[PDB]
């Protein structure tokens, strides 16, 4: 508000208002609205008396501009812009000279043409309202009352104005402009500041019943009311209370730094129990592909026809048999569902019009497999109270499982190169700046070392499967739709290729929220005998569906071909999480580039040609029974991508906490390795926080073993 | 007729009549912020789904006369108005053609960046551990001769001439920038709102705090993703009328006027005009001065 009243008014009026407040005893920084009101009143008073003069004879003139002619009276007296005592003396002098009557209250100006005093009032509210009290306060003491408004209104005694149209119009225009500017700046809160006639209130905010009573119960003890607390706080000096309280405090409250030495850490304690089992949405290293070299003709197309063409390339189907039962469900339903899928795919090739989507018949097999069997109904508690078994939904601690070797082999496979491409990124503008060249070098090397990677296959597989699931759930909210698992890649010699991994049968996907589960049955081809690691396949029913003729230089071998069938469930947040799996490439590139930048900041040079193009350099990226194994930069990039993909793929709340705590442990270890004399305050508590989230997850339990190996090798 | 009918329909009720008969024009920005909220749960997926189907876009009825109902290959472009992106491509392909002579004047701010980057010189890139200083840099360098308020008045005199307001309608002298901008944008058809936004970007200065290690000329702040990074610095050199208010509306002085009918009123006579975005005021050409 101060900026407005200082920028909108000339320095003379600002100084006069400052003197007026000094005489009245107020602070302009605090009472901004009073300052603005005083400045407006003074400015209007000055505009009232300007260019107006008394002619030598009984006449008045409005000659403007410089008038050195003299001999003309000013026609008015300035009384507002003067001290109280000086203003009173001037008023008395002019009254005696003209024999007028001294007003009961101080006047504002004195008209010379007509020998009467005049009082100007600039109101921010209704003009007639303001005039009412202005006249009530000023009784008799005949004095003209002229009132302006911030809206262009106006009112004068007996409607007898004492100015020409052009000057009152100028005053009204100035007030209108000031009001418009205050409105534009949001400073038009002085509308209510005029709570009394010719007065500017502070801004009243009060605490009364139900807030004074609530304010007398929300303050430290030994204090009766908020006013007493305010009085105590107002009078308070640092007498040394902290020192006395620390003196009185018990010495048992301390932060003793226990040194963190090379021999203090201990390996993390992993759970012991039945081995952990696979939990991914789709098979990762056991997935088998039925591939067709799509004759170019790129453009997506209809996935169902691609799946049918992939199916038609395989001869070797046999009578399905259950080689590994699920041990928790009706096993014959699984192979019956597989047989139904085969039968429906065959029927599709005998219809008048080829569907673009297939809605499966709701058979009892698929009504049980997809959990369509009536789930517990939503009764009211007041009617089901007497059931004798009513506990809470969870009512159980998680089962403890021990790390198995299958997850490590899965990760080892996720870091390997494939024969296909799995990613084709678009072009960008040609590099023109040296930093652009450096960035392009980094990105091109990373992409070259990563495009033909298994983790990229997993990324594309998840993206495609989750996209199909989301589309089917949105457009088939009541049908048991069949959703092929399809991906597309580019062989070494071009030749785009479409791969079929299996099928998904979706359930009744009436998903209102983002956390509602849609159930489905996933049936994926594989060549892996389930009887080698049965514990891994604890959630699957594995059938033996066919025989696949693989090629060897010597001849054609005949391996068995199994189908891994399991009932799973996913919500829309999980579908979106899967669809957004291409960000794993971004995360891995961010990590590699962050390492390059960190090492470039040291040595004050671009450390990009020493990561790539330096075949001599290697990073420790594995462990063998002899010791720590090294690898090239490409293998490091692939390993980081695989780690990111698995994090996005085995996401769990036990991984987020484990990473956070193991990060602190790793930072302590690094501080030890840097000879920085690290120290902890409660290392046992940190270890407990790390281990409280090692329960059953395979990925987290493997990360814990990785950390144990790192601890073993680093502090050596 | 349409907007007045809608106003009458809105005041037919009582709650929406009280919202209109009480809230002054000043308290409109406050009322305009009472939206509902959370109308975009997943905009990317919705956009993809809408593009999957045909006729995702909406257009004016005039489409039916300009773009043929069917493509050269037989693909339908529009239908009963709903339109397909094939129609957008068709318009960009062989639609009506006009003269793009006003674009380099309305979007001059964007075409100055292109000419500064095109002729810029690139030096070597130095990798070090420099420290960034939090300076107060100018994102948009405003006109030297115009402040923020003077630039807003230039905009409201060039884009919305009939809603200027009292300050812009009683000021004695009109800036030359306004005259040249009016002359340049005389036959512009881009859009009033877009013209105003681009003029604000060109004229109004904008300042903010950035951690910049180097120049702050506001020609080095546009290229900052490019010049400086986490541990490197890229050396770069960019290329290169008077009225007086008398009071409220008076019925004795005839009907109200716009701010474009004041140019023919008279010299020294009274008339009531609609200024700003609201109240009608009685004014007169300044007889004096």
């Amino acid at each position: 508000m101060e900026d407005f009243v200082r920028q909108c008014f000339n320095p003379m009026i600002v100084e006069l208002a400052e003197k007026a407040m000094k005489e009245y005893g107020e602070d302009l920084k605090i009472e901004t609205n009073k300052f603005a009101a005083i400045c407006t009143h003074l400015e209007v008073c000055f505009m009232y008396s300007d260019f107006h003069f008394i002619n030598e004879r009984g006449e008045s003139i409005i000659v403007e501009s410089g008038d050195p002619n003299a001999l003309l009276k000013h026609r008015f007296e300035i009384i507002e812009g003067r001290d109280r005592t000086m203003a009173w003396t001037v008023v008395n002098s002019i009254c005696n000279t003209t024999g007028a009557e001294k007003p009961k209250f101080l006047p504002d100006l004195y008209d010379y043409k007509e020998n009467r005093f005049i009082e100007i009032g600039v109101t921010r509210r209704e003009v007639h309202i303001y005039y009412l009290e202005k006249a009530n306060k000023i009784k008799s003491e005949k004095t003209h009352i002229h009132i302006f408004s911030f809206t262009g209104e106006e009112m004068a005694t007996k409607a007898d104005y004492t100015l020409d149209e052009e000057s009152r119009a100028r005053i009204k225009t100035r007030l209108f402009t000031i009001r418009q500017e205050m409105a534009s700046r949001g400073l038009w809160d002085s509308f209510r500041q005029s709570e009394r006639g010719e007065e500017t209130i502070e801004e009243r905010f009060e605490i009364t019943g139900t807030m004074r009573r609530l304010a007398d119960q929300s303050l430290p003890p030994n204090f009766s009311s908020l006013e007493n607390f305010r009085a105590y706080v107002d009078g308070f000096e640092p007498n040394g209370y902290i020192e006395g309280k620390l003196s009185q405090m018990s010495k048992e409250v301390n932060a003793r730094i226990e040194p963190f030495l090379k021999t203090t850490p201990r390996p993390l304690r992993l759970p012991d129990g039945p081995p952990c089992s696979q939990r991914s949405k789709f098979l990762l290293m056991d997935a088998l592909k039925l591939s067709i070299e799509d004759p170019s003709h790129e453009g997506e197309g209809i996935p169902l026809y691609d799946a049918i063409k992939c199916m038609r390339t395989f001869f070797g189907w046999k009578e399905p048999n259950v080689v590994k039962p699920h041990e928790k469900g009706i096993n014959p339903n699984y192979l019956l569902a597989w047989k139904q899928v085969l039968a429906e795919l065959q029927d599709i090739e005998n219809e008048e019009k080829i569907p673009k989507t297939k809605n499966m018949k709701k058979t009892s097999q698929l009504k049980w497999a997809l959990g369509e069997n009536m789930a517990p109904e939503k009764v009211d508690f007041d009617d089901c109270k007497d059931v004798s078994d009513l506990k809470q939904y969870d009512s159980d601690e998680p089962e403890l499982r021990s790390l198995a070797s299958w997850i490590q082999s899965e990760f080892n496979k996720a870091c390997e190169l494939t024969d296909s491409s799995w990613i084709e990124l678009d072009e960008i503008g040609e590099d023109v700046a040296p930093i652009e060249h450096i960035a392009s070098m980094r990105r091109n090397y990373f992409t070259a070392e990563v495009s033909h990677c298994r983790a990229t296959e997993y990324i594309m597989k998840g993206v495609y499967i989750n996209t199909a699931l989301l589309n089917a759930s949105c457009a088939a909210m009541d049908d048991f739709q069949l959703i092929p698992m399809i991906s597309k890649c580019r062989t070494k010699e071009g030749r785009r290729k479409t791969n079929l991994y299996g099928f998904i049968i979706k359930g009744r996907s009436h998903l209102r929220n983002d956390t509602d589960v849609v159930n489905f049955v996933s049936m994926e081809f594989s060549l892996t005998d389930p009887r080698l690691e049965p514990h891994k396949w604890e959630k699957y029913c594995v059938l033996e569906i066919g025989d696949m003729l693989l090629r060897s230089a010597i001849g054609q071998v005949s391996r068995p071909m199994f189908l891994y069938v399991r009932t799973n469930g996913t919500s829309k947040i999980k579908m979106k999480w899967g669809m957004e799996m291409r960000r794993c490439l971004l995360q891995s590139l961010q990590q590699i580039e962050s390492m390059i930048e960190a090492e470039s900041s040291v040595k004050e040079k671009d450390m990009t040609k020493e990561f790539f193009e330096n075949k001599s350099e290697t990073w420790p990226i594995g462990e063998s029974p002899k010791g720590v194994e090294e690898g090239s930069i490409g293998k490091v990039c692939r390993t980081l991508l695989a780690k990111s993909v698995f994090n996005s793929l085995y996401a769990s709340p036990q991984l987020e906490g484990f990473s956070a705590e193991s990060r602190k442990l790793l930072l302590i270890v690094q501080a030890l390795r840097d000879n920085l004399e690290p120290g902890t305050f409660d290392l046992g508590g940190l270890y407990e926080a790390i281990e409280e989230c090692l329960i059953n997850d395979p990925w987290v339990l493997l990360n814990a073993s990785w950390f144990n190996s790192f601890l073993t090798h680093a502090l050596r | 007729m349409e907007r007045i009918k809608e106003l009458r329909d809105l005041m037919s009720q009582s709650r929406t009549r009280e919202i209109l008969t009480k809230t002054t024009v000043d308290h409109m920005a406050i009322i305009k912020k009472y939206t509902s909220g959370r109308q975009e749960k997943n905009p990317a997926l919705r956009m993809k789904w809408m593009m999957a189907m045909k006729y995702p876009i909406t257009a004016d009825k005039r489409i039916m006369e300009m773009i043929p109902e069917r493509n050269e290959q037989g693909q339908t472009l529009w239908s009963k108005v709903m339109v397909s992106p094939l129609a957008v491509t068709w318009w960009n392909r062989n639609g009506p053609t006009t003269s793009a002579v006003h674009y380099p004047k309305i979007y001059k701010t964007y075409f100055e960046k292109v000419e500064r980057l095109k002729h810029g010189t690139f030096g070597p890139v130095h990798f070090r551990n420099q420290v960034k200083i939090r300076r107060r840099v100018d994102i948009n360098p405003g006109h030297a001769d115009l402040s923020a308020k003077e630039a807003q008045d230039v905009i409201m005199e060039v884009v919305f001439p009939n809603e200027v307001g009292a300050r812009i309608l009683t000021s004695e002298s009109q800036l030359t920038i306004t005259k040249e901008k009016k002359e340049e944008l005389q036959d512009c058809k881009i859009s009033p709102l877009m013209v105003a936004y681009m003029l604000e970007r060109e004229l109004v200065r904008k300042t903010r705090f950035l951690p910049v290690a180097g120049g702050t000329s506001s020609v080095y702040i546009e290229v900052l993703h490019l010049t400086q990074g986490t541990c490197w610095e890229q050396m770069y050199t960019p290329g290169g009328r008077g009225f007086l208010i008398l009071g409220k509306e008076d019925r004795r002085y005839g009907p109200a006027l716009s701010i474009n009918e004041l140019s023919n009123l008279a010299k020294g006579e009274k008339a009531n005009v609609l200024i700003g975005q609201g109240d009608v005021v009685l004014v007169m050409k300044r007889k004096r001065d």
């Binding site: 640092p238 009513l390 392009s440 961010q590 990226i621 | -």
Partner: protein, 678 residues
């Protein structure tokens, strides 16, 4: 071999490759009443030795541990001492003279000149009219409606302080009528005003006082160098460098310097709003009583806050196959046989505090709300470390925030470091700050961490920002191209996005844009519904580098030109024909910079949209309203009617409009006037 990525740290220091220890890029795909009960129990158990009093208004038990027994063990304790807090605040004032007066003076202007609409700008807020989490604007509109239904309308002036005056005056009303007609007595209205929902949102009646308190605390923190909260980006790394430079200027290099990479997780539960009230009372000394009052309301309401237990529990049967949901509102008398033995203990130990479906929570705070004020409280301790206060050979300084804290202690020897750390910890315990001696470690200065900023020998790595989504924003195909590049450029400028990472993010964004809008380049063979038109356009254009990506043109965007709109980037290469066709103002289809072209198309409380209709009508009458906020003393209806009359008269006299139109419009104006007069 067996691939073990962690072994990568055997060669690359931890800080350099610490980006590999953050698993996710974005919110994970996973996420209660049990947790809320646990939080309440922990809050009341960390301060169990305080006084117990029954509120005379809310009729709830309340725990007052302030000035309670001094702790005698290294366990979280909420027994903050009032004298110690006031002394710390006074010493903070002494170290920075004029800080509180200047901050209060700055805040008075914001208090006086803040509009009610500012209260709509945030996240979902508990709505007491519907007892549900609703958007901020919807909650404010509902609160205004239910306030007007009763004789409470002063918010009809566009001032947040007036809305808060209405809020305070509403608590004196002996009844509150909610029409949708429910009737809430005084106590049930109070219990809902002072209610916090569920990581916890306050009602619409606590959220303006909180805003004023946060403004004051932000003003104070701006002047405190230790406070690293208000800043963000590459100027926090400046703070991390400046603190180390100040502390590591050892003359004679005979002063050991040790950095505590501090952590204080779950330190809000020991924040008692009475301490915040004392802080505000001291901060606002010698200030107008109205300012003191308005700033002394948020702590007052937080001292009597109530916590909703949430949705509730849910049982299940196997002999009947039935699921039953049980709201927490009735979770006060239900027989305990139904509950597990852990939830059983929780309910048993929380029952004394439950009233009217909510649990009384006097001690402790919740996430958010008082972040800046707590930063000020921590900076008080960090400022008490100067040698003029710790009158000993040791001293300390550091950085504070609402999430993490980092300390640096300089002392002549190891015993001095230990003494300084003990004094810091004990002072923190005195003022109610409970350092977590479980996630905090100490090591020689030169390497540490603060709010995911890792400082190592002068190099700071920032990992506090999630990598943003790099897909289409789904407005249209002209706004998305500008928004993606603007997002990438802003991440490069602020969130330390790498050059190569930025380029590959741009590549992925272009891929997503092309696959969403089906605008694959014109020389490809991707067969799509939009392929024929784009491939025909690609064959008639002689300069194929001027075509927009939306028209199957090349991608000319790189790091150096992310700040240039595409239309202006390609303008010099566009064909004169295609320029005219694309940028044709008479086309049927119509923070980010975007030229308007044919690609800027548009795709397919009794009245929630009543406020959004009058504004649109005004925009129709006065287009400038869409650009500049309107100004005027007349009502909306008067301005609209005048616009209609002066726009119809001129059209009639100009020939554009007929005469019957004139008569009908000027009569509709008359009826609109008559409706107004009612």
């Amino acid at each position: 071999m067996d691939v073990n990525p962690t072994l990568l740290f055997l060669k690359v220091p931890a800080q350099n490759a610490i980006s590999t220890t953050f698993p996710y890029t974005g919110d994970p795909p996973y996420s209660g009443t049990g947790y809320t009960m646990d939080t309440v129990n922990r809050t009341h158990q960390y301060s169990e030795k305080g006084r117990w009093t029954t509120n005379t208004e809310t009729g709830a038990p309340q725990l007052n541990p302030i000035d309670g027994p001094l702790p005698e063990d290294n366990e979280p304790s909420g027994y903050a001492q009032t004298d110690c807090v006031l002394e710390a605040m006074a010493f903070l004032e002494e170290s920075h003279p004029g800080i509180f007066e200047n901050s209060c003076l700055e805040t008075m202007e914001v208090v006086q000149q803040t509009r009610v609409d500012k209260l709509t700008q945030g996240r979902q807020t508990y709505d007491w009219t519907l007892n549900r989490n609703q958007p901020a604007a919807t909650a404010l509109a509902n609160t205004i409606e239910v306030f007007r239904s009763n004789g409470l309308t002063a918010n009809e002036s566009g001032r947040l302080i007036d809305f808060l005056k209405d809020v305070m005056e509403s608590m004196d009303k002996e009844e509150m009528e909610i029409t949708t007609k429910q009737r809430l007595n005084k106590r049930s209205y109070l219990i809902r005003a002072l209610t916090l929902n569920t990581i916890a949102t306050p009602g619409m009646q606590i959220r303006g006082f909180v805003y004023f308190v946060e403004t004051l605390a932000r003003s104070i923190c701006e002047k405190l160098e230790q406070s690293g909260l208000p800043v963000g980006g590459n100027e926090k790394k400046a703070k991390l460098a400046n603190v180390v430079r100040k502390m590591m200027t050892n003359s004679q290099d005979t002063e050991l310097s040790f950095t505590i990479t501090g952590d204080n997780t779950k330190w809000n539960e020991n924040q008692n709003p009475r301490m915040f009230l004392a802080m505000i009372t001291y901060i606002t000394r010698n200030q107008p009583e109205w300012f003191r009052n308005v700033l002394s309301i948020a702590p007052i309401m937080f001292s009597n806050k109530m916590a909703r237990l949430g949705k509730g529990y849910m049982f299940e049967s196997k002999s009947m196959k039935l699921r039953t949901q049980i709201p927490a509102e009735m979770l006060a008398s239900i027989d305990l046989k139904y509950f597990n033995d852990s939830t059983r203990k929780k309910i048993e130990k929380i029952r004394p505090l439950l009233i009217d479906g909510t649990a009384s929570l006097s001690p402790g705070m919740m996430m958010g709300m008082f972040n800046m004020l707590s930063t000020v409280l921590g900076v008080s301790i960090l400022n008490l470390g100067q040698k003029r206060y710790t009158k000993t050979t040791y001293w300390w300084d550091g950085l504070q925030s609402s999430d993490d804290f980092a300390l640096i202690v300089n002392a002549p020897n190891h015993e001095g470091i230990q003494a300084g750390v003990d004094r810091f910890y004990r002072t923190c315990k005195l003022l109610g700050i409970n350092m977590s001696k479980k996630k905090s470690y100490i090591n020689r200065t030169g390497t540490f961490e603060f709010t995911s900023f890792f400082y190592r020998y002068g190099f700071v790595a920032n990992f506090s920002m999630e990598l943003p989504s790099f897909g289409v924003s789904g407005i249209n195909e002209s706004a998305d191209m500008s928004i993606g590049v603007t997002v990438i450029k802003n991440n490069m400028i602020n969130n330390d996005l790498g050059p190569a990472t930025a380029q590959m993010a741009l590549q992925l964004f272009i891929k997503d844009y092309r696959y969403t809008y089906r605008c694959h380049r014109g020389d490809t063979q991707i067969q799509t519904r939009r392929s024929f038109e784009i491939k025909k356009l690609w064959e008639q254009t002689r300069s194929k580098a001027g075509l927009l990506v939306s028209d199957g043109g090349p991608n000319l965007y790189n790091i150096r030109n992310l700040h240039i709109p595409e239309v202006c980037l390609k303008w010099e290469l566009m064909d004169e024909d295609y320029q005219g066709r694309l940028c044709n103002p008479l086309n049927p289809f119509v923070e980010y910079d975007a030229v308007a072209t044919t690609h800027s198309w548009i795709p397919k409380l009794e009245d929630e949209q009543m406020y959004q209709k009058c504004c649109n009508l005004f925009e129709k009458f006065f287009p400038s309203s869409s650009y500049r906020r309107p100004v005027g003393i007349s009502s909306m209806v008067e301005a609209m009617v005048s616009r209609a009359r002066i726009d119809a008269r001129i059209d009639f006299e100009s020939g554009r409009i007929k005469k019957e139109e004139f008569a009908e419009i000027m009569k509709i104006c008359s009826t609109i006037e008559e409706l107004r007069r009612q």
